């Protein structure tokens, strides 16, 4: 029937959005907590468990739809999570 208010990301505009968010965390300093997180890797961004974070989360984006501003919303969160 009529188009749904869905318009979700595609897995490639996904992984796109992933490779940002992951580039936004080691473009701040931030990327430090990554790296704590896993104890003691690089910047592993943790892929694995960002990537499940992120995939949990993924309605978030639909609060706003930006880039940046989105990143500072997971800055916050990153620090208390």
Do not use: Y
Not at 17 to 27: A, R, T, V, Y
Not at 53 to 63: G, N, P, Q
């Amino acid at each position: 029937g009529p188009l749904g208010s869905m318009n979700k990301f595609t897995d490639d505009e996904w992984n796109q959005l992933k490779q940002d968010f992951i580039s936004g965390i080691l473009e701040n300093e931030q990327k430090d907590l990554v790296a704590k997180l896993t104890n003691s890797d690089p910047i592993m961004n943790q892929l694995d468990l960002l990537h499940k974070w992120l995939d949990r989360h993924r309605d978030m984006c639909e609060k706003w739809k930006s880039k940046e501003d989105i990143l500072h919303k997971l800055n916050e969160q990153w620090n208390k999570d």
